[PDB]
Amino acid sequence: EGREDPQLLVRVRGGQLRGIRLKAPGGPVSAFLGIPFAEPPVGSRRFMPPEPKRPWSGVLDATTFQNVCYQYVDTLYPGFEGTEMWNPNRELSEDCLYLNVWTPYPRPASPTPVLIWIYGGGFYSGAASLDVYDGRFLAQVEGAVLVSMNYRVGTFGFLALPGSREAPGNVGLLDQRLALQWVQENIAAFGGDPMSVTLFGESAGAASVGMHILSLPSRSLFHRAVLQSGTPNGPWATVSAGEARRRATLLARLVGCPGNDTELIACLRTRPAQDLVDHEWHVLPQESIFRFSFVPVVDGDFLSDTPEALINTGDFQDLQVLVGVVKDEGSYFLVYGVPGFSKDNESLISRAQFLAGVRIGVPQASDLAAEAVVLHYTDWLHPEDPTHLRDAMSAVVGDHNVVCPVAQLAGRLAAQGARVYAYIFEHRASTLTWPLWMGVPHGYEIEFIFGLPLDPSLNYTTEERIFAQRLMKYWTNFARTGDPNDPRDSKSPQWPPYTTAAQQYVSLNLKPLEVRRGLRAQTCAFWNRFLPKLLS
Amino acid sequence: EDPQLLVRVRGGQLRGIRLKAPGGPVSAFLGIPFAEPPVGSRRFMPPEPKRPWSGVLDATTFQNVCYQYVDTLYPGFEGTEMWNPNRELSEDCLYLNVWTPYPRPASPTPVLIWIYGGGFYSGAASLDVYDGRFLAQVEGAVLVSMNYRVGTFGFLALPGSREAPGNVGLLDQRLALQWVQENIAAFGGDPMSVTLFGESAGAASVGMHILSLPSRSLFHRAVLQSGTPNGPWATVSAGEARRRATLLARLVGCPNDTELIACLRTRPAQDLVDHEWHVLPQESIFRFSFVPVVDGDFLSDTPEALINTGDFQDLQVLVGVVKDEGSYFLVYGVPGFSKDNESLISRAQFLAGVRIGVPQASDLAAEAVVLHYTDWLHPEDPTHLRDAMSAVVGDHNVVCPVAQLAGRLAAQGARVYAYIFEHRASTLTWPLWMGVPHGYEIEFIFGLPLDPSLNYTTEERIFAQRLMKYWTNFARTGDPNDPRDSKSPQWPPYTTAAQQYVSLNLKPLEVRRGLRAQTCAFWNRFLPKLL
Numbered sequence A: 001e002g003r004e005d006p007q008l009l010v011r012v013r014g015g016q017l018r019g020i021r022l023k024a025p026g027g028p029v030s031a032f033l034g035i036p037f038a039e040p041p042v043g044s045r046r047f048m049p050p051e052p053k054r055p056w057s058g059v060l061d062a063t064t065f066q067n068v069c070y071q072y073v074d075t076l077y078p079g080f081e082g083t084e085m086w087n088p089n090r091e092l093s094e095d096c097l098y099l100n101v102w103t104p105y106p107r108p109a110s111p112t113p114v115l116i117w118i119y120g121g122g123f124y125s126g127a128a129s130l131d132v133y134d135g136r137f138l139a140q141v142e143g144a145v146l147v148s149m150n151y152r153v154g155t156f157g158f159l160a161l162p163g164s165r166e167a168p169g170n171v172g173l174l175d176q177r178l179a180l181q182w183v184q185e186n187i188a189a190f191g192g193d194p195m196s197v198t199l200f201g202e203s204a205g206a207a208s209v210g211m212h213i214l215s216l217p218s219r220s221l222f223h224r225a226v227l228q229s230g231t232p233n234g235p236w237a238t239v240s241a242g243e244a245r246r247r248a249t250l251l252a253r254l255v256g257c258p259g260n261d262t263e264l265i266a267c268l269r270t271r272p273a274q275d276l277v278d279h280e281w282h283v284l285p286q287e288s289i290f291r292f293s294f295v296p297v298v299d300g301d302f303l304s305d306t307p308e309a310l311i312n313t314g315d316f317q318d319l320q321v322l323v324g325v326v327k328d329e330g331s332y333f334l335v336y337g338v339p340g341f342s343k344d345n346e347s348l349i350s351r352a353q354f355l356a357g358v359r360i361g362v363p364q365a366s367d368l369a370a371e372a373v374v375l376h377y378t379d380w381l382h383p384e385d386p387t388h389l390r391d392a393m394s395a396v397v398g399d400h401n402v403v404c405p406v407a408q409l410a411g412r413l414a415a416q417g418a419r420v421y422a423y424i425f426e427h428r429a430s431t432l433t434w435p436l437w438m439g440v441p442h443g444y445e446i447e448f449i450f451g452l453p454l455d456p457s458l459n460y461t462t463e464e465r466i467f468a469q470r471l472m473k474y475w476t477n478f479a480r481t482g483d484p485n486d487p488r489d490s491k492s493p494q495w496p497p498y499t500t501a502a503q504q505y506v507s508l509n510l511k512p513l514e515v516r517r518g519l520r521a522q523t524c525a526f527w528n529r530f531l532p533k534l535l536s
Numbered sequence B: 001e002d003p004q005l006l007v008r009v010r011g012g013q014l015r016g017i018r019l020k021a022p023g024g025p026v027s028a029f030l031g032i033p034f035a036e037p038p039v040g041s042r043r044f045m046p047p048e049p050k051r052p053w054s055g056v057l058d059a060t061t062f063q064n065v066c067y068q069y070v071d072t073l074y075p076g077f078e079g080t081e082m083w084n085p086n087r088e089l090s091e092d093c094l095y096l097n098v099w100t101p102y103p104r105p106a107s108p109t110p111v112l113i114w115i116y117g118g119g120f121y122s123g124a125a126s127l128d129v130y131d132g133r134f135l136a137q138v139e140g141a142v143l144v145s146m147n148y149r150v151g152t153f154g155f156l157a158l159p160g161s162r163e164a165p166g167n168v169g170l171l172d173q174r175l176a177l178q179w180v181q182e183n184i185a186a187f188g189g190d191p192m193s194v195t196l197f198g199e200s201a202g203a204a205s206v207g208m209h210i211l212s213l214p215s216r217s218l219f220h221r222a223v224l225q226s227g228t229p230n231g232p233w234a235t236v237s238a239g240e241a242r243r244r245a246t247l248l249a250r251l252v253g254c255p256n257d258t259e260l261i262a263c264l265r266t267r268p269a270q271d272l273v274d275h276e277w278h279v280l281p282q283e284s285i286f287r288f289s290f291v292p293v294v295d296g297d298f299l300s301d302t303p304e305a306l307i308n309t310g311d312f313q314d315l316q317v318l319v320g321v322v323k324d325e326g327s328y329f330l331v332y333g334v335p336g337f338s339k340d341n342e343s344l345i346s347r348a349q350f351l352a353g354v355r356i357g358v359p360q361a362s363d364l365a366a367e368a369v370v371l372h373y374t375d376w377l378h379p380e381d382p383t384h385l386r387d388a389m390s391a392v393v394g395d396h397n398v399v400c401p402v403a404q405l406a407g408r409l410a411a412q413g414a415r416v417y418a419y420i421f422e423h424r425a426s427t428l429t430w431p432l433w434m435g436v437p438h439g440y441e442i443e444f445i446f447g448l449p450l451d452p453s454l455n456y457t458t459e460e461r462i463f464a465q466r467l468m469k470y471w472t473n474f475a476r477t478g479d480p481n482d483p484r485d486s487k488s489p490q491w492p493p494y495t496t497a498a499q500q501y502v503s504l505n506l507k508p509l510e511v512r513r514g515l516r517a518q519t520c521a522f523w524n525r526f527l528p529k530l531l
């Protein structure tokens, strides 16, 4: 060993690690980046469940982020910070099953609450190495141990021929689970407490957290959960076994792969990764937004039944969850495929463009159901006002895909024994490069939770820095105790739990917490109670 | 003998009576026959004009009320008995009433013709709330009201038959309108300025005269209070009238059309009334057994079809609703509702109430109504459920049909003014939870609060004076705004763009936009698509 910072040498079950001392605003942190937690899922292991990483010899260098899992790279607005901040920032490879750990420097004396982040990206993209997921602030300021993992996305993570041995489905979820098992066995080496593990995630990451709540083998690996702008229930986070089969075999056809499952998957395994990515988007059943080709499948194994069935009959007595949404969940999706919408103008649309947007934003809906949506979201005082139509198209997509599934989830969890806290995040970052009409888009709370505004080189306002400190405190208080409130700080306004009776939730913005009742209650009765009865 | 009380009409001489109003005397000619008594072989038949009479006909008292069911839900209760017949029932009931200023006007005066409501099964022009003396005295109006046949006698139809063609009660009204053209000048009225006004079924009747060409030369303007020709209760198809007519005949022991109607004509009047209510196709409220029928004659098509394609360019209309249209209907058949308690109901009672209040609705459609009107913050709160039940019935039957009518008339060239009446009378005997019920604006428009023996407040007297002005200004000019008052807030016309209407209450006029717009989109655009 010899001459190295002794605070950076650590042993886990697979061997020795060397981390790096990083600078955060208030002082140093330790990071162990690029720790392998699985055998590289390459070759005959593509589409297969992950196997645990075999021990290595020598001191593994854990000072840089490892490869990003193979994925489609967004080129809608190339060169534009608003999109590129989500794009991969390391090399793409199928050899991507690595995780990251930040801890205080020096490492904590007594066992510390662990937070595990699961990124989103529609189950087709994402990486734990993106700047907005930087764990250094939470580790330095709140003393947290923060863990994030890469999991397979797209076909590599979710392509399924259900019932098969060679493509069983949900393997990306199994990568996540394996990283959680890794934290149970190994996080104490870093000063983390394996008995206090809080999962948090956004969008597909949040849906992922929800699937770990609903899947029994994952339940012993964590104690609390945070779902930001996503759920396992709802229209995009799962597919039936039949629909996944249909998408897998269509994709196979598109890349020249012909009849039994073994032979089809063996041929898919000979294809270059980039081939699979180039046809991934061509298997969706309609023109649509907020739909992704390869997502968790209701396999009868990882998911013993649909998420809707499991949240309706689950016993959630021992469970604390924090859930919420941003003010404008739907806005950004509109520029990825609704005619009339762009980031470079005000996107004022016509009534005709609104009806056409609804067919795309609600692709599974019949004619009757789409007229119901249109009639519900039309302002009948200004039925043709292009500003109102624009904002209504954003709300349709936001409510159908996020806000109403979250309200449904919170309601079922609460009624069935869970302690639930709910929020709406309404602060638009001063540094946002998306246009004003998009408001607070899907994903733009994350940089505040992780504490980026504390970095003075990023140019957030002082108020934003104080707001980020507040949120970091809510999230880590929740990780520590199951309650986002500070016990010592009595006079600060309280965040009451969500109940079916009172339906309380809080506004997260620059002003002190304000308590509201009813999470889009009238409109979510439309989506969650009425619309389903209009598919019978 | 007072020569202001002697008038010569086409059929002969009349003697009226000088009545006292608060501010001075008025002349009234009550009980003037405008048709041959529609009795015997004339039952179910179009009215024939009254034959001339000899001498001086005494027109100093109200005549008989048209034969009808008398309400016995709350016997001796003012709130119900004020709507019950106040003269003898008879099939011989085709008489009209005229109030005029005393002395009779020097120059020709705008004429207002009232058409009473009562679901096409009841009512009378003789009720105290239809007293024309206040409008006559204070505004100098000539006010006319007529009896028309109701129930089977007025609307029993075997469509296409010669002996029960349907809509005869509407033809009674039309004949009284013809009478006014030929005769009202003798009283100082202007036949060139005739405004129809009516409430509930009386309003739907006014609407049916708008939509029927032969009625259109008999008036110039119209007011429809809490009622429309479109909507779920004011018409039936020819097939459904035939069905109800032949069911009713079966219930009284009768018997082709000729034979069936001849046997019905032998039955005492009360036998017909006894079985009237048993022909409705479901358990329901705000539904009536014998109503105007889409005959292809008086009504050439459904009222929906006629308002959609009509040209209403030279028409001025005033329309509106009260704050709680559906409230009272609830105690006439929805389990859980009574006048004598607060009617706090359960969710289960709300779902059951909706099937009754929207009787034509499928399972899915009734679930949409329940889901729309539930407050999802307080889904089980009994106060919210009670008020929502009232709203369902009021919106489905009155408010939304009115918003649809106003919209179509405005889009198609009519000058339209709309209101919501929100003042609850201090003298109301119905309970607080019913709010401002269907019918309780009428006493204000007719000016009853000006009678100091009736114990309205001073504020109520001044409010009634304001309304009497709006209504008679409208009759005079087609515009309810006082052409003298150079201060605001003016009552603007209703249009499909702006959708402006006004609140009538003790406070000065307030202009609002959108008459239950979201909710009426539900009833008027979505539910039809749920066929």
Ligand SMILES: Nc1ccc2c(c1)c(-c1ccccc1)[n+](CCCCCCc1cn(CCNc3c4c(nc5ccccc35)CCCC4)nn1)c1cc(N)ccc21
Binding pocket: A073, A074, A075, A076, A082, A083, A086, A120, A121, A122, A125, A126, A202, A203, A281, A282, A284, A286, A287, A288, A289, A290, A291, A332, A333, A336, A337, A441, A442, A443, A444
């Ligand atoms: N080359 C093709 C061919 C066919 C289709 C393609 C692309 C696309 C397309 C997909 C991704 C990016 C651009 C275009 N689409 C559109 C997919 C539209 C749905 C995805 C929208 C989307 C895009 N991203 C990029 C990831 N970035 C983000 C995020 C998050 N937030 C934000 C906020 C603003 C901007 C981006 C962003 C938060 C979570 C993580 C990632 N995530 N989600 C198609 C759709 C069809 N129905 C059929 C075919 C095709």
Ligand SMILES: Nc1ccc2c(c1)c(-c1ccccc1)[n+](CCCCCCc1cn(CCNc3c4c(nc5ccccc35)CCCC4)nn1)c1cc(N)ccc21
Binding pocket: B071, B072, B073, B079, B080, B083, B117, B118, B119, B122, B123, B199, B200, B277, B278, B280, B282, B283, B284, B285, B286, B287, B288, B328, B329, B332, B333, B437, B438, B439, B440
């Ligand atoms: N004896 C029977 C037998 C069977 C049925 C009967 C009655 C009734 C019923 C009818 C009238 C009165 C009481 C009971 N109903 C109930 C019919 C519901 C429709 C009548 C509701 C109604 C009753 N009135 C009385 C006239 N009074 C008013 C009004 C107006 N406003 C008001 C305001 C408050 C109270 C009354 C009132 C304004 C305009 C004119 C008359 N108008 N409208 C049945 C229904 C069915 N589906 C089947 C069978 C039967």
Ligand SMILES: *[C@@H]1O[C@H](CO)[C@@H](O)[C@H](O)[C@H]1NC(C)=O
Binding pocket: A339, A340, A341, A342, A344, A345, A346, A347, A348, A349
């Ligand atoms: C904004 O830009 C898009 C795509 O370039 C275009 O289709 C749309 O019509 C524009 N909107 C307006 C009102 O300028």
Ligand SMILES: *[C@@H]1O[C@H](CO)[C@@H](O)[C@H](O)[C@H]1NC(C)=O
Binding pocket: A457, A458, A459
């Ligand atoms: C932040 O502000 C500085 C100082 O003026 C500027 O030069 C820098 O480029 C900005 N950086 C970002 C992240 O926008």
